[model samples]
Target chain A: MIRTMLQGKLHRVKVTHADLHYEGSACAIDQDFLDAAGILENEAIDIWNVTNGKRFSTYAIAAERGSRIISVNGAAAHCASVGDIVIIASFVTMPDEEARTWRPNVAYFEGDNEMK
Target chain B: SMIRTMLQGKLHRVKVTHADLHYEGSACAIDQDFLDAAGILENEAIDIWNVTNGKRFSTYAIAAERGSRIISVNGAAAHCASVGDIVIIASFVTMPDEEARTWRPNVAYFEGDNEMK
Candidate 1:
């Protein structure tokens, strides 16, 4: 039930321990989405710097609660992970081909869909 | 219209036939485990009439309003409601799950919860 708010504004979805939303070392994240949120590279690294620069069409996981960290294609969006509603603002590129018609899509929430 | 003007210099106003509203749980008594938290006593009842179906509903102690054909819910700070991230006077409905999540009043959600049909 992973509902995507498109690539408009990143959001802070409700994170809970039971949701398996965290990892001991780092967590999965969406780098393209983070970058689209206007976060600088330095900001990402200082936050925890898990997966370097990776993007995922789906399953952009975030780090532990308030960790300010996230896991991307293979890296973390930043070194830190805070439980702040992120703006999944935009995508690095519209690979869907159909996305050109929906540029700058509105924000949507990911439901109970598995991303990893 | 009484024109409940907020004294913030020039309060730009608009008419919203289908706007939304929200209530603050922190400000309400529910968080404190008191009866007043219901917010009915402290807040005013807003009128809602569906334009398409002509369905009418009243909401008390709303949380957030989103959608079209409305005003003052998500307007620019200068020309509408919502001031500097400080929200005031918004109307909203709840999903069945959200009602139980936040513990809204029964009357507020009678359409589905207490359905007689």
Candidate 2:
């Protein structure tokens, strides 16, 4: 009776860095946005590239707070490009009984990840 | 100060039972037993790596009917896989240096009809 449900998501955030040379699979997001979205540091996240239809699962890493940053790092960097719009989602596992009423937090951003 | 990322759970080489491109959910349906055995929870994000087509995509896992033994790829994810295709469904989690040393993950090996072999 376990259910892993969507806990929260950062919607349509713009990718600021596509660092293919950086160490892989660890994508960066501003700490402010992560806190607002309830995404934990090093939490597993699914990244969907809207611009190119690419998809990958990478862990979250907190960038400087108030920096308005979303960096695509490592092997996943090739799947995203600067200015690409990506949706990041985090999930949590719980008993099915508790999942029925649980809601999710979503932080929507525009042009530069400005809160929407 | 190395932070390590690792696979948390994996369903290795499970056969696909159905692929419905018209289904709107786009979530991959896995058998209840396989999900449980692989430590995968319903609705958790999983990377589907197709062995038949060499494609990889991310999708959430949904528990199919208990004991139904179904592995249906629904919605847009269906385009990346087809019935009878074998896929590796994996979920990853990360931890700090101290905790990474002893981490052991759930890895279930499977074969035909989604059998745990």
Candidate 3:
């Protein structure tokens, strides 16, 4: 029982900690933490491995004119903090049945909200 | 130093309450005094905690042979127990890279004299 509130929007974010944030899709940027933490670009990452320890795996994302939101279906344990790097996975809108199986629900947005 | 001492004290009080208990993960070397107090056995499943700074010198495994006093870090030996030390056994769940998570509480007690405040 998941839904995508924002149909289309561009999002951007930055990281402030020293944890791993994998860029699974094309929307990822080259971040300094990847080099400082000595992580290979091809390393396998899980949501648990991404957000652990208060000082690591931080992430965030923002869109030009959309309401940014995220919904996690799987029981992938995670923690959130300000200024964490965010990775946005993009895909075409699909039927509820197809969307649930094909992709993980991502944060979407379109409004006059401020991203801190 | 503060984090290490506070961690040691809080953990010590809890572990000393339960007997024939289980220990998970590795404890710092400074806990040598702790092992001697609790009288732990050998070849037990102990996890690792690399908070090395406020702990016994980073290289405590080399100086330990007995099973009760061990430090299972990257590639080293575990420390054993001796007299005049207090042992604290704490069981916690730690993911390699997941956010900080705390599991059930574990406490056990042992015999020790000349304990420091």
Q: Best candidate per lDDT, number? A: 2
lDDT tens readout by residue for model 1, B7-112: 1111012223222232111111111111112222212223333333333332222222222212222211111222122222222322334333544332211122
Q: Residue B58, candidate 3: how far off, in angstroms?
A: 15
Best candidate according to DockQ: 2
After superposition, candidate 1 runs with Cα above 4 Å error: A1-8, A16-32, A35-107, A112-116, B1-11, B15-17, B21-117
Q: Give the per-residue lDDT digits (tens) of candidate 2, residues B1-117.
A: 566666778999999999864433447888888888787766676889999999988777878998898889865576688888999999766566777778787898986667786
In candidate 2 chain A, what residue range of length 10 has the lowest lDDT sum?
A: A93-102
CAPRI quality level assigned to candidate 1 from its DockQ score:
incorrect
TM values, all candidates: 0.23, 0.56, 0.22
* Model 3 CA lDDT for position B6: 8
For each of the candidates, give the backbone clash count: 51, 1, 39
DockQ of each: 0.02, 0.14, 0.02
**Interface Cα RMSD of candidate 2:** 5.6
Candidate 3, residues B1-117: lDDT per residue as tens digits?
000000111123211111111333343332344444333323333322112111111222111343343322322223332222233232222222212112112323333332333
Residue-by-residue lDDT tens digits, candidate 2, A13-104: 88999879987678888999999899999898988766666777879999999999999867788789999877788888665467655677
Off-target runs (Cα >4 Å) in candidate 2 are: A1-5, A8-116
The lDDT, on a scale of 0 to 1, for candidate 3 is 0.26
